[PDB]
User: Fold HpcH/HpaI aldolase from Desulfitobacterium hafniense.
Amino acid sequence: AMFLKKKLSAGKSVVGTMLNLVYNPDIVRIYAEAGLDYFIVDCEHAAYTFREINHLVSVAKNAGVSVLVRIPQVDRAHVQRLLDIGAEGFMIPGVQSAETMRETVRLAKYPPLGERGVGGSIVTDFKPVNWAEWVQERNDEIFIMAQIEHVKAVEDIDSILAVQGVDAVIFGPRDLSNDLGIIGQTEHPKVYECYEKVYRAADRQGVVKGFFTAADAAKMGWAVERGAQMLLWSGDVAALQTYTAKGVKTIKELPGFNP
Amino acid sequence: AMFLKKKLSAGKSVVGTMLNLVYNPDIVRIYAEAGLDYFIVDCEHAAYTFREINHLVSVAKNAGVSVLVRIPQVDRAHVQRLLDIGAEGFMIPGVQSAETMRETVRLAKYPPLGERGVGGSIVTDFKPVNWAEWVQERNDEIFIMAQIEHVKAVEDIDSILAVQGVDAVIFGPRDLSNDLGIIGQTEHPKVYECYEKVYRAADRQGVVKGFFTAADAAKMGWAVERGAQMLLWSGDVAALQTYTAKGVKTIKELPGFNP
Ligand SMILES: [Zn+2]
Assistant:
């Protein structure tokens, strides 16, 4: 019923992409066939409803694909409902303190690790369970990932990543570059310095290393060299814009084309 | 309010793609930005509802993108409603006789060119019109395209393309290759022989030439050389599968990736 942490725990590299536009649940089958392990629904910067997410999850659960959600704020409404619906976990944006992680974990974990409420029906994928065992096992499979976008978070990174229940760390390069006063220069040496500092803290704290690259898959080499297991590349929108624009341009450049 | 025939009439080459998966209406804005003139909603092989099409059209009407629909059969329910909703016209699949075209035109054109019923509201994009002039002008802008998929249609092509109101002709290479007993061999010389025969008839009948290529944009050169104005390349699904699979594969091939 849960696929992501099992892979990470076995030392595997896993590959995901962002989902910002498409809500047709067949995108899940396309992504499975393309060899993706997971994808992240962008509820921070897009309009996805919880019903749409349920539809995605319903297809993903039997396709062997994990659904994570990037939530706009940490509260019970987001965390409780999305885990109950069947997202395997979260990317928490702009994490700046241990407290944000403590609160995420409190909402996401069943007692005694947290205060997540125990529901039924879709919660257990409509299957019967041994409750006492099941809550313990599920707590071990919920995935929590901190996204770092602030210089201040980088400076305080050990405190953030030492919180019990934090599974992985990743970056938001655009916001981070903005915080460095060089918005959009996501390949700047100062940005990579931040990455390095965070990766060293992740190593110290036993936290999985993640990396996002927005356009060129080859740029993931940098993260893979450094032992990053959570690989997040591009997204549906970039796929549609990049592929479509390229072909159209090729066509409009054919000899005989009449503009 | 209508964009496609105006371009074709001016001798322009125009570029479109198939829509089979995405129904988020923002796909229209993505396609406009990518430089597409039109796209074709696949109602023959996919699940699109007329409401979904209305949503697409509502965005397209002010984006300067034309929406065509590939309908599964020619009847009043499809033709009347879709034109009223705001599709600029149709790709009619597997056309095998003049009669199919006569019936398409009868349903699609206002009197005296046809028997299309005159409605209101969305029909005129919610704008007031001079009815007597407006129906005449609209009849000149409705787009009807015959898709050829049978050897028998190729043999009878002059009769099919001579029907008044037929604007353009195109091919369904997979079905055509199937009818030639070589299903899937869409680059076979026998397939191109058919194309040539149809193009010669299109020239004789004053009908616009169209061409579909499923994967490689460069293969459109063949059609462009031959004066084809209706260029139809790939589609949203191929875009998502091709782009995504490529990047994922690149990532999984990085040194240090742990499968
Ligand atoms: Zn969609």
User: Anything to note?
Assistant: The pocket of zinc ion is lined by residues A 22-24; B 22-24 (CB under 6 Å).
